[PDB]
Design a protein around this ligand. Sequence first.
Ligand SMILES: CC(=O)N[C@@H]1[C@@H](O)[C@H](O[C@@H]2O[C@H](CO)[C@@H](O)[C@H](O)[C@H]2NC(C)=O)[C@@H](CO)O[C@H]1O
Ligand code: NGO
Length: 499
Amino acid sequence: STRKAVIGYYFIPTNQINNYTETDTSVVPFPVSNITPAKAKQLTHINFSFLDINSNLECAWDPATNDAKARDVVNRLTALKAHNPSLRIMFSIGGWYYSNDLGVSHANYVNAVKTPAARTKFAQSCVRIMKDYGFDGVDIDWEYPQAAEVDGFIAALQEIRTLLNQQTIADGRQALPYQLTIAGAGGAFFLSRYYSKLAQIVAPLDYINLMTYDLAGPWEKITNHQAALFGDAAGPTFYNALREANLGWSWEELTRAFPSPFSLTVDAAVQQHLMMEGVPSAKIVMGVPFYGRAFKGVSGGNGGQYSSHSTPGEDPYPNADYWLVGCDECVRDKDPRIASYRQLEQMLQGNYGYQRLWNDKTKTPYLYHAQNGLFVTYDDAESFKYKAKYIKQQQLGGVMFWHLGQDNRNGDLLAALDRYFNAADYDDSQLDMGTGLRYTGVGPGNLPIMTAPAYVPGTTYAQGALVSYQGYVWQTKWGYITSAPGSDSAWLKVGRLAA
Ligand SMILES: CC(=O)N[C@@H]1[C@@H](O)[C@H](O[C@@H]2O[C@H](CO)[C@@H](O)[C@H](O)[C@H]2NC(C)=O)[C@@H](CO)O[C@H]1O
Ligand SMILES: CC1=[NH+][C@H]2[C@@H](O1)O[C@H](CO)[C@@H](O)[C@@H]2O
């Protein structure tokens, strides 16, 4: 069918731009030249990151950026399009550091979207930056607009969309039109900020790239998988904040959509998006991490899963104890809590004391260091088999990942994703998706196909009775009901009739 999107972040800090070199990994660990022609062919999008919104309320580079060096770096990325006529070099505005609630630039995000005039100036600046530097689209990663700010955010996305469409016409770019994406929340707490208006958020986008990772971290009491596909009943559960969003739904409607507590998983986030009317599966992109999250002070018994831990949650990491044995990149980056897949492979291969274990419910690997009490949750080419099959079964738009520098030197994670979507000889028809917990919620946008006998006027229906009526299958919430389905509050729309 339609090719699945494969969207990889290229993140480069300002000091690495300003000192850019392709021949000294101690200055720039992952220069553009490491994205070989083979890797460029396996990507559909590279998200160059991160730009910001400045105090003038315009899209802008970090003001410390050497502009000549920035253009050189971007030009090296756009040169890769010679190897892949489908490849887009997007640019990403925001990210956690700039745009989180306490981030250095947060007020600029709030203010840029707040009024019609601000939105026009902001939208114009986005497209100007896109054209000036040669990017192929705009990606906005505000983490995250609050419920009160959502209407302005929506209007800003709509305005950027119109300007991008104008630019596509001006440049004759119908074969590769300029695109608009966002990085969206991948867990219900942040998602609840804008969930009620999800259809309006997604309408102007080519894709919403779900950040379906960081679902565990040092801010939680209990270690867990950070990107479990399905749930493990032995693992923690979470309050379903979506049931408190301003939806206007009834008790039965909320309960059917938002089981609580629930397992915080990739499947949960995807299904939460599909449950909403007007959110098409083809626009949902599943994010995956190319890094693991490491915890210390864990107990034994279950390989470090679901244990208390003593991992500092502060930023920056508060001391110089780099306790993730074998993680040389952690020493370089002064933080033992995150390890690239590239580094995790070496840690497993060296004499460092790790076991690689597998949770067959979550379909994800983890490392356990029994002697020191360490636990690492990460993803690999095996967990990507199940996630790729899920992407195909659920008819999602594709996959996104953070970030390209964390794949191994040979690009094995990217090559695996490309194989699972595109290789003619790859067969996952027999890949068993397991018995992990699925998110069972149903909403207006994901009604299952059902059959039931036609509703009969005058018949007295007991609680739980199912009838077909006017294109849908309905269930009584109590009994005895004689009203026509949809005419009052007694009937729940539970399914749709096949065409
Ligand atoms: C919002 C999301 O998808 N993930 C959030 C994390 O990005 C964030 O972790 C922080 O990310 C920064 C940007 O990469 C790092 O500089 C910072 O070290 C890191 N902090 C920690 C403790 O991991 C966390 C922070 O609470 O929130 C996630 O939700
Ligand atoms: C889409 C993307 N932007 C965010 C998000 O990924 O999580 C990353 C890893 O936690 C973080 O570094 C970044 O600021």
